[PDB]
Amino acid sequence: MFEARLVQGSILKKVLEALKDLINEACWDISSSGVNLQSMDSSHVSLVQLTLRSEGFDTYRCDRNLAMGVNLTSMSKILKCAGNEDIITLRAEDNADTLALVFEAPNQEKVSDYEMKLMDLDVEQLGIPEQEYSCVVKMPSGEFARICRDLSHIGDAVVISCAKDGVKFSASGELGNGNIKLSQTSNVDKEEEAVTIEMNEPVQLTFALRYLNFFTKATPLSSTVTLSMSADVPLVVEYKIADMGHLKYYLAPKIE
Amino acid sequence: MFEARLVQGSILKKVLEALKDLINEACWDISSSGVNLQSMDSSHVSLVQLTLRSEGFDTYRCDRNLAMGVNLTSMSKILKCAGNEDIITLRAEDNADTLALVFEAPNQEKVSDYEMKLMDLDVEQLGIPEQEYSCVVKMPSGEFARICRDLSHIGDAVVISCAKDGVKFSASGELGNGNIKLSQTSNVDEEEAVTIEMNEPVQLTFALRYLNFFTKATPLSSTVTLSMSADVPLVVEYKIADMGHLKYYLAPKI
Amino acid sequence: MFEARLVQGSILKKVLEALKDLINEACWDISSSGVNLQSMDSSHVSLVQLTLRSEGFDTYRCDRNLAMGVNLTSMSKILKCAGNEDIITLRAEDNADTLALVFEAPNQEKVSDYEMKLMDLDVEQLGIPEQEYSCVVKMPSGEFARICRDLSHIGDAVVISCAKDGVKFSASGELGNGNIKLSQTSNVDKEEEAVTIEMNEPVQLTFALRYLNFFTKATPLSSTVTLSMSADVPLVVEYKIADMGHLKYYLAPKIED
C-alpha cells in the first residue's frame, strides 16, 4: 500500500497551504515513482502542477498506482494539527477510501492519528504542451512576492517585461501607475540573492494579479522563484521544493 | 472595608481573561480567608470556581464577609487599562456599589484610579461535592490547549480515555476522525513531564466548545490537572501562582 | 520643477500613516523653504499642520511655489509600496497633474517609480497665531498613547485638568469612571521619559477621545509629545520630527455649559 514517511512535515504543510486557496479539491496521483498533482483552478485560467519525487521521502513504498481525490481544504485543516517539526507518515491502504495521516513527534511522547475521508474525483490529466520560453528570470522569492503584493495595490493587471538589462513589472489603475524594474545582479554575494535573466528575445505580457498573489503563497517553500515565459504562452512560476521536487504554476495571459 | 493590595497585578487580568466569556456576571464572595467565585456558565452547563487566598495578595483587609456583585465584562474592560507590571489595589468600600480599583505604576508616578459600578446580584451558589477522582492527569497546559484546539477542527465532541500508561483524546466528524495519544513522560525532562494516576480505566465524551472555553486560562499555570471519575463532571484545575486555584467542572454528555 | 530626495525614507511613510485616517485629502504647499500642510478635518473639529523644512531633505529643489492637492489615502497606498530603507524622491513638474515618487532600494538594483495622480483642492490657509499657552506638558509619546487608548475604554470624552502639581486626565462612562493623574518627573538620567509640566493658570478642558486616538497615530514619529493648552483655545498636540520639522494637531474643546 501507499506508505510514505516525510521527516519534516513542514514541507507537506507548506505545499497544502500553497495549493489550498488556488484549487479546492485535487486528485493526488500516487505512483511508484513519486507523487503528482496536476489540476487547474475553478476558473480554468491557471494550472498548478506539483511533483514530489520518491527519493525525498525516508521510506516511500507504493506497489499499486493510486488516485486519491482529497479535498485540499480539509487536508490542510488536518495538516494544521501537525506540529512544525513532526515526522508525517501518509498511509493509504490498497483500497480503503481513507488516508491515514500520522503525525509523530520529534522523538517524544505524542503521536497523532487522523483518518481523512477521501472523495471520488473524476481524474483528468490535460496535456501540458512542452515549449521553449524566450525569457527566464530567476529571482529571490521574497522580491517577487513583494512585487506582486505591492503592484496589487495599484492595478489588477501586471505587465511583465523582459529586456536584457532587467525585467520590469508595470501596473496602472485609478490612483496612477507604477513600475518596478529589477536589474540582473553582477556580483552575486549569495546565489539566492541574485537575479539572473536568461533572455533570448525581449518579451512583454500582461497577467492578472489575483493569480500571481495565489502563486506567491508558496514562498516559504523555496527562496528562489523562476519566472519563465515567452510570447503567447502561459507564464510559469516555479518553486523548487528542496531535493524532493517542485511546484509549478501556469498562468494564461490577459486579453487586451 | 475590603482593601486588597496585590503586587503581581497582572495575575488578576489573566483571571478575568478566562471568565469574561463564560461568566457574564459573578458574585465575588469576599472574606478574611480571601476571595471566592462560584457560578455556572451563561447557559447553566458547566461550573467554574475560583479561590484566591488572602495570603496571596500583598496586603489584605476585610472587615466583614461581603458579596460584591460584579459584571465580569466591564471589570475585564477596566483591567485592560492596567499595565503589565502594575500594582492593583481593590479598595472596596463597606457597602457602596462602586468598586474602587487603583493601578499604581512602580515609581512611574502614573497613579490611576477606576470606580466600577457594581451589581446588586445576590444569587446563591450550590455546594460543590468533593470526591476522590481516580483519573489524575497532570499535563502541560500548552499541550492540552493544543490538543483541544486541534480536535476542534475535526468534530464537536471529544472522547477522552485513560490507561495505566497514557491518555487518548479522540474525535470524529465529516472530515474524518482524529486520535492523539499521549503517554506519561518516562523520566524524560519535572517541568513539562506528563503524569497519570489511574486505579481503573475511564472514558467519557465532552463538548469541545467548553473545553476550548476552559483552555483560555492557559497563561495562568503552565501545568493543568485533569480528573475524571466515570459518571462525575470532569474537573480541570489550573493552579495560580501560590495564590489559589481555578477549576472548571464539565458535565460529560450522554 | 520640485524635486526632493529624502534618504530617511521611513519618515514620509510614518507621516502619511499619521494623517491618512484623520485627513482624507490635503494640499501640500511646497516652497523653497520646505513643505507645509495645513488641513482641517472634514467635521471642522480638528486641524493638522505638518512642516518639513528644506534643510531636512537630503536634496531639495523648488523653483515656483507649488500647491498640490493629494488624496492622502492614495498617497498612503502608494507609500506602502516602499521598504523602510528606501530613499524616497518626490518630483513634480511646473504645474503637472501627477507626482512621481521614486523609491530606491539602498543596496540593490530595485528602483520603483510610482506616479500618483493629484486632485483639485481649493483650500484657504487658516490663520493660526503664535500663542503663549497656559499649560505645557511635555511627556513621552508612548505614555500619552497609552493614556488615551485606556480612557477610550471608559468613556468618549476626556477632561484634562492641568493643575499646579500635575496633569490629570479623566473620563466617565456607563461602566464607571476613571482618572489618570500624572505627576511631574524628577531630574533622573533618561531625558525622554521626564514629564515636564509648565503651567501658569490651572486650566480644565473637555476633548473628544476619537480625535485624540487619531492624534496618537503619530507616536513612531518622536518619543516626546507636547500638549499645549489654554482656556477656550484648541489643544495643541505637537510631535517633533527627527530634526526636519514638526506635526501639530489642534483639537477643539467640547461645548461647555
UniProtKB/Swiss-Prot annotation, chain B:
CDD domains for the chain: PCNA
GO biological process terms held by the UniProt record: base-excision repair, gap-filling; cellular response to hydrogen peroxide; cellular response to UV; cellular response to xenobiotic stimulus; chromatin organization; epithelial cell differentiation; estrous cycle; heart development
Residue positions, PTM N6-acetyllysine: 14, 77, 80, 247
Subcellular location: Nucleus
Sorted UniProt keywords: Acetylation, Deafness, Disease variant, Disulfide bond, DNA damage, DNA repair, DNA replication, DNA-binding, Dwarfism, Host-virus interaction, Isopeptide bond, Methylation, Neurodegeneration, Nucleus, Phosphoprotein, Ubl conjugation
Residue ranges the record marks as coiled coil: none
Effect of residue 251 to G: Complete loss of interaction with UHRF2
Cross-link (Glycyl lysine isopeptide (Lys-Gly) (interchain with G-Cter in ubiquitin)): 164
Post-translational modification: Phosphorylated. Phosphorylation at Tyr-210 by EGFR stabilizes chromatin-associated PCNA. Acetylated by CREBBP and p300/EP300; preferentially acetylated by CREBBP on Lys-80, Lys-13 and Lys-14 and on Lys-77 by p300/EP300 upon loading on chromatin in response to UV irradiation. Lysine acetylation disrupts association with chromatin, hence promoting PCNA ubiquitination and proteasomal degradation in response to UV damage in a CREBBP- and EP300-dependent manner. Acetylation disrupts interaction with NUDT15 and promotes degradation.
A single cellular component GO annotation: extracellular exosome
Family affiliation: Belongs to the PCNA family.
The protein's role, per its UniProt record: Auxiliary protein of DNA polymerase delta and epsilon, is involved in the control of eukaryotic DNA replication by increasing the polymerase's processibility during elongation of the leading strand. Induces a robust stimulatory effect on the 3'-5' exonuclease and 3'-phosphodiesterase, but not apurinic-apyrimidinic (AP) endonuclease, APEX2 activities. Has to be loaded onto DNA in order to be able to stimulate APEX2.
Note: Antibodies against PCNA are present in sera from patients with systemic lupus erythematosus.
Entry protein name: Proliferating cell nuclear antigen
Name of the gene: PCNA
